[PDB]
């Protein structure tokens, strides 16, 4: 019965994030000489050009990590990350200007990505 003012007594169990959404594992490598850290909610296909991965597998997706956290890639680092599906209307605007509409337009996203030199198209 020691009193910590304002303390939590959390219930039992765990919280599953992004429940019921398709998950996808891909390998991603930082081909640059500076660190890249990627947040939980950036459309994954629109990340830094020098990250090499199968760009098509980033479309309509983001990292499957707790809201507000980030995956870090040191210079030269290659590792696997798990992605989850974007929700809501599954539309993306701005960021790197690769989508600007439905994430279903894969060919259009990939063509813009290729022209601008975002690594790993094909």
């Amino acid at each position: 019965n020691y009193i910590v003012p304002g303390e939590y007594r959390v219930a039992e169990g765990e919280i599953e994030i992004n429940a019921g959404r398709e998950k996808t594992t891909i390998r991603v490598s930082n081909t640059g000489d500076r660190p890249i850290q990627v947040g939980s909610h950036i459309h994954f296909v629109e990340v830094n050009k020098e990250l090499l991965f199968d760009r098509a597998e980033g479309i309509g997706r983001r990292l499957n990590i707790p809201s507000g956290t980030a995956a870090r890639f040191e210079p030269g680092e290659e590792m696997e990350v798990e992605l989850t599906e974007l929700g809501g209307n599954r539309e993306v605007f701005g960021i790197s200007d690769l989508t600007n509409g439905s994430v279903d337009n894969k060919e259009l996203i990939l063509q813009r990505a290729k022209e601008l030199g975002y690594k790993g198209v094909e």
Binding site: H41, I42, N64
Partner: protein
């Protein structure tokens, strides 16, 4: 992927089933529901969710469902529930309670809670959020009292006075059209909502009514101006015509009548009974019997709250001091002894717990403490849990029922009684965005940030010369909401319908938001949220013992309270 609950609660605040201790009390609130989608929690910062293209929508202009302000991950404690939600604010009002973000990429986003370019963010993860407190027994005696109130989470002051004049020092009254006009102009520089009560005294209608037309928001009957059958009757006639509330401090001396005579004068009409226990004033010794009737909206003031070992010694002497009573005059001693009663003060604790007294208030600077309404409400709830145990209605070992009963006493119930609950008094959509953020360790004691009409007005914050805002000294400070003309948009002057219709704000050059007092005459005890109990209260004239349903209401005074010496420097 799963996160354990300790880590989830640290990151985003608690979620369904988790409990949180209120300050250093033994009271626990439990999250009843959560409007989030796990994984799509809103948060702000480097690499976080509320960024353009992501949790922030970059498409929509402000008018297209975008918020001015999102409070993320708030633990709401309100009469409507104890639950987890984002809170959305626009045009100074709460427009959405649910889940904010960007429907481009997020599931479950409340349609009018889009975080866009126009949106400011306040992180409320790990905070408890309540409505601003509504203090309906304020004496306007010293303007320094406002910050005192804000610092304990009060956002609306209803009452009266003109400063430290004897009339105001005794009674919540701003007498007559001129004094009312003056104080309405003064109010232009007070960073808190205000409503002003006129003198509820007279034997003709016109002298009372002209105060309502001048801009008063209600009336106070006080024995110091003559709480006679006539003054009671004319005030209630005026109030029924004007749609404003009447508060009463009744005739302690029983000079023109006993309680039953005052009730006869009221004649079934609605009235707000101040300091119903009676230490603050009223028919000795049985005023608290008011609290059993369906037409009475009963409030306590805060110095009797709760019953402690120093209470009686303090009050007997306080009364000798403020009434200039002499120890050598036996009628003075008898008067004090008939007014300060352990029997009724102990019973008052219990009546609060039973939902028979519906409201708290301060009695600021007359016989009560401007910054301790919220504080003493929770100290009372805590004492009652210790002495009476969890209420029958409680569920998962939580104190949620008691917490809703008690939070209602200083938020929604005073708003309803005063006819201002369409604007203030709870965290509901369509109401004014008066919100108080609390760290749970400081809950009820020291407010973290006070939001008034969607802008922070007051905050506990540190060194203004520092690299960041957290270095010492951390103290309560007025924020940008109180500065310049912004004080006009973030605060409400509540006024009578007739004064509004007769153009008083324009006449006086008032720039503050004007709120309409209404729906005061058609309510009763049944409308007091979680505190709607009517019953026959018997107070024994010889022993002062209080009985409800055949049983004596008594409890012991406590030697120690939470929310006291662990927190306060003096």
């Amino acid at each position: 992927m799963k996160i354990n609950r300790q880590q989830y609660a640290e990151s985003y605040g608690p979620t369904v089933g988790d409990e949180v201790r209120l300050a250093d009390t033994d009271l626990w609130i439990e999250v009843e529901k959560d409007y989030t989608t796990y994984g799509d929690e809103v948060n702000f910062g480097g690499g976080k969710v509320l960024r353009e293209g992501m949790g922030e929508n970059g498409t929509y202009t402000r008018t297209e469902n975008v918020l001015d302000l999102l409070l993320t991950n708030a633990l709401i404690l309100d009469y409507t529930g104890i639950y987890k939600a984002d809170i959305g604010v626009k045009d100074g009002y709460i427009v959405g309670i649910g889940k904010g973000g960007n429907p481009d990429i997020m599931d479950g986003v409340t349609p009018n809670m889009i975080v866009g370019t126009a949106t400011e963010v306040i992180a409320a993860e790990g905070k408890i959020v309540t409505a601003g407190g509504i203090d309906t027994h304020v004496h306007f005696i010293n303007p320094d009292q406002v910050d005192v109130a804000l610092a304990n989470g009060i956002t609306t002051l209803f009452g009266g006075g003109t400063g430290p004049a004897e009339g105001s020092k005794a009674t919540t009254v701003t007498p007559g059209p001129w004094n009312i006009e003056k104080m309405l102009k003064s109010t232009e520089g007070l960073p808190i909502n205000v409503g002003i009560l006129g003198k509820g005294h007279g034997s003709s209608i016109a002298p009372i009514m002209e105060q309502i037309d001048a801009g008063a928001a209600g009336l106070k009957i006080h024995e110091d101006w003559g709480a006679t059958p006539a003054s009671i009757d004319r005030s209630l006639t005026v109030a029924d015509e004007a749609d404003v509330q009447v508060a009463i401090h009744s005739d302690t001396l029983n000079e023109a009548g006993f309680l039953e005579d005052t009730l006869r004068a009221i004649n079934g009409r609605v009235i707000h009974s101040f300091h119903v226990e009676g230490a603050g004033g009223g028919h000795a010794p049985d005023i608290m019997a008011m609290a059993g009737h369906p037409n009475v909206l009963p409030s306590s003031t805060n110095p009797t709250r709760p019953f402690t070992v120093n209470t009686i010694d303090e009050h007997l002497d306080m009364l000798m001091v403020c009434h200039h009573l002499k120890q050598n005059i036996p009628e003075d001693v008898a008067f004090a002894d008939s007014r300060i009663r352990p029997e009724t003060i102990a019973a008052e604790d219990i009546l609060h717990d039973l939902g028979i007294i519906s409201m708290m208030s301060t009695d600021a600077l007359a016989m009560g403490r401007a910054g301790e309404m919220v504080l003493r409400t929770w100290q009372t709830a805590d004492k009652m849990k210790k002495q009476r145990g969890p209420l029958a209605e409680e569920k998962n070992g939580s104190d949620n029922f008691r917490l809703k009963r008690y939070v209602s006493k200083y938020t929604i119930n005073p708003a309803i009684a005063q006819g201002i609950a369409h604007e203030v008094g709870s965290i509901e959509e369509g109401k004014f965005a008066d919100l108080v953020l609390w760290e749970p360790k400081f809950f009820g004691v020291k407010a973290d940030r006070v939001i008034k009409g969607g802008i922070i007005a007051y905050a506990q914050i540190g060194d203004p010369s520092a690299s960041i805002p957290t270095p010492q000294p951390v103290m309560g400070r007025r924020m940008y909401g109180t500065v310049g003309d912004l004080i006009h948009d973030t605060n409400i002057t509540f006024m009578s319908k007739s004064s509004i219709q007769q153009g008083v704000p324009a006449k006086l050059g008032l720039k503050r938001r004007i709120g309409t007092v209404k729906n005061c005459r058609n309510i009763g005890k049944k409308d007091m949220k979680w505190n709607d109990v009517t019953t026959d209260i018997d107070i024994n004239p010889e022993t002062y013992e209080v009985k409800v349903d055949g049983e004596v209401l008594t409890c012991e005074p406590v030697k120690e309270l939470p929310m006291a010496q662990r927190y306060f420097l003096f």
